Design a protein around this ligand. Structure first.
Ligand SMILES: Nc1ncnc2c1ncn2[C@@H]1O[C@H](COP(=O)(O)OP(=O)(O)OP(=O)(O)O)[C@@H](O)[C@H]1O
Ligand SMILES: Nc1ncnc2c1ncn2[C@@H]1O[C@H](COP(=O)(O)OP(=O)(O)OP(=O)(O)O)[C@@H](O)[C@H]1O
Ligand SMILES: Nc1ncnc2c1ncn2[C@@H]1O[C@H](COP(=O)(O)OP(=O)(O)OP(=O)(O)O)[C@@H](O)[C@H]1O
Ligand SMILES: [Mg+2]
Lengths: 308, 308, 308
């Protein structure tokens, strides 16, 4: 039971930025490039005989067709076991926020297809993860990121979530907390996702908040941020139109509020010539801040993806 | 239809340089090393069902048995389609000048087996390529190298060639032009190759010229260069003697033309124990310039190559 | 006859150091981390038809599940041939001292599982190796490490050993000499290993000495070191207890000998769920020097290893 797998997707990005300059000016420009969209390669397997138990391992890395890259196992790679009790695994592994993540499936490039600012804390760390099996559509998992920090007060972080799916219907909580980080102190991220996922239709609303203690010097400082996003995919024959909106908020206080708010949106589709082979078309838009000091950006492109 | 493939070739290089010296100067020396000769690995495939169309993808990278290396998809790797209309493909891809290139098949190392100075503009860039199918021995292709440069005046470059083969007979034009480059404004490279390739015999003469505008500070400055090369390979049983000459002429300008001319030559053979497994033996020689300030170099070695 | 193979092993390391101090100094601390234990990936093969001869090639590289890594063929990778006469092979290849090495099979991490200081000269160099076939349990091999050094007086090194195995019984001499090194003029390393290896029991004693000329200013300067180690492994059902001791002696010369001596030991086991899948447990201890300026360290951990 050895398997070699992966996916290759690439194509062109036409992109533009409008940098404001309301106060003290200039507005930069289009960049148009050939870009490998998240391409990558993996090997992996499982063994039995063995028992009710099975051994699982994987090694996956970034394979850029464009070859802007380097390295091994910078993808999700691990070793672990699954059994009556589910899977325990270790090594480079996905954030519990990273594996909700289903509401943000935009094949993308050096500049965001979308929806990014909301997916900023979706990571891979060298860590440990338990994922409990299903019971009545129920699931849960937990993750430790020791690395490493003792040493000082621990920058190890802490990850877990649960997932319900009942009849094409779902919600997923994912959360992260961090005992310490420099250029920060104990930091928290929370996400709930819910929607229908099934039969040629998908819709989801997700909400993430992050509450953070701050300024290890100039205490007590702190910030909160909040983001919403929503996505509707659908399908027929081979085409799969999809759309997403994301509004992040700013925060308050610190002595000053402003509005650090952002809005962004994406639409595009997929045309399956086959299961594996899908043509991709994508157009996003985003705006940071508002008024005289502010920002806008607009991306679009095509791409191919062949999964194997 | 997945495939893993590649080739491994390595072996020893004995090398020497004679650096010419009106003194204050000196003549450097032999270096003798174990060297991986162009060794590398690849995966790739194609899909149908599908249609008259097929999906092609490849990921190939430098695999040094000597491991002086790093990375992924720094070989020719891509994604594209073939069909009635031929192949369109994208990602890291070979120059049109790089895919004539048949006249220079000397497995080589850190220093020049040969024939190098004439193969200097044979590249791989992240780009787009169309290769039209065969009609009556006829073929053609085109390539865009956007990356990236707008930004400023575009350093994107431009590549295409055609190929005729009739009855073990061939000619290949390949050409490159560059809208911009820092230290060469608007630069051009042209190559014609012709010869017999077939049935245990190969002979070819190829000619490349490069005409270049020069902005360095320099307006109006400019240079031309020209290179000829010729190669005769032949075969029996398992041995495949081969030989190559290359004479470049000078960059001609600046009130002393001088002579920047160079001459170089290579001979060696191949002994197939099988299709895949061939023992390689090679000796080159080169000379740059002439007279009191000048250069000479002499290389030779063995190696093995097993293709898979 | 192509083969993809490798092994994945990872897990946790709890570690501690006691650094001895009149102070300026102090006694440092535990570090506890998830660590990929020597994990890695390879491809390779052989061909015939061919003859009594066969072609062998391999490309193996470090694959860290933890992905602290980079690169290709930094493992043992080569090309060569085997036949009546045995194997000649080239490329990145294992030191003759490296392939005795059977007495030190502790899956390990960034800090030593064990037994390290004795395995310090077990290497891979870009080089050439002949390994003669078996005759009456007899074997031999020789290695040249040219790279590269002429240039100056040659830092190429020199490697060979022999191996006897008769009825679960063995001894292996491995030796290394180096014509030059900056940090060693003309350096030598010798190892004998002997023991029973067979049928669920393994025991070995090995001895290494290294005699070295020292050029720095110092002529004539020089040092000798000596190290002993011993290992007992055994097996039942699926568990495989093992233990190892290593005592190095000092460099002794130059009017003050001191004692640069060190002692270290390791114990732990393996539990095969299968041939491939083994759970690993390990505890080592080491001490450098003695007295008021000195050192101690203690490591322990678990890990999984799945070979493929
Ligand atoms: N660090 C990263 N940088 C860029 N893109 C990423 C990163 N992490 C994840 N991605 C993108 O997220 C996608 C995950 O979606 P998909 O379901 O296709 O794969 P996946 O489930 O992550 O695969 P695996 O389970 O092996 O990680 C990847 O294909 C990749 O395009
Ligand atoms: N960066 C490089 N510069 C010059 N020559 C190279 C370079 N990389 C590879 N080569 C050599 O060019 C030779 C061309 O031979 P070959 O046709 O087998 O490969 P290729 O056509 O480039 O590969 P592909 O099947 O991916 O198109 C190869 O043997 C390879 O070792
Ligand atoms: N640079 C290194 N640092 C630490 N440990 C290493 C290093 N190189 C090899 N090892 C360990 O030594 C062990 C050697 O055992 P093994 O026989 O499996 O490999 P090998 O013989 O070196 O490779 P090959 O199968 O290609 O001959 C490996 O398990 C490996 O993890
Ligand atoms: Mg994807």
């Amino acid at each position: 039971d050895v398997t070699l797998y992966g996916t290759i997707k690439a194509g062109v990005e036409t992109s533009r930025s409008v940098a404001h300059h309301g106060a003290q000016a200039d507005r930069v420009k289009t960049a148009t490039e050939i870009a490998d969209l998240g391409s990558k390669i993996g090997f992996k397997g499982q063994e039995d005989l063995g028992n009710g138990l099975k051994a699982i391992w994987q090694l996956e890395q970034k394979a850029y067709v464009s070859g802007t890259d380097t390295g091994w196992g910078n993808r999700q790679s691990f070793i672990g076991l699954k059994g009556g009790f589910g899977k325990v695994r270790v090594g480079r592994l996905n954030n519990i926020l990273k594996d909700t993540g289903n509401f943000n499936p935009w094949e993308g490039k050096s500049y965001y297809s979308g929806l990014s600012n909301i997916a900023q804390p979706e990571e891979r760390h060298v860590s440990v993860r338990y994922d409990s099996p299903e019971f009545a559509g129920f699931s849960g998992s937990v993750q430790y990121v020791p690395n490493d920090n003792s040493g000082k007060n621990r920058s190890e972080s802490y990850h877990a979530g649960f997932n319900y799916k009942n009849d094409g219907f779902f919600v997923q909580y994912a959360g992260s907390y961090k005992r310490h980080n420099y250029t920060t102190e104990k930091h928290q991220v929370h996400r709930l996702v819910g929607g229908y996922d099934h039969d040629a239709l998908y819709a989801s609303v997700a909400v993430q908040q992050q509450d953070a203690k701050l300024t290890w010097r100039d205490d007590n400082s702190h910030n909160s941020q909040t983001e919403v996003a929503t996505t509707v995919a659908y399908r027929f024959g081979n085409v799969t139109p999809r759309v997403s909106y994301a509004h992040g908020f700013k925060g308050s206080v610190y002595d000053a509020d402003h509005d650090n708010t952002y809005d962004q949106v994406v639409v595009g589709a997929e045309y399956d010539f086959s299961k594996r082979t899908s043509a991709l078309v994508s157009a996003g838009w985003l705006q940071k801040g508002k008024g005289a000091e502010k920002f806008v950006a607009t991306v679009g492109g095509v791409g191919l993806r062949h999964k194997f």
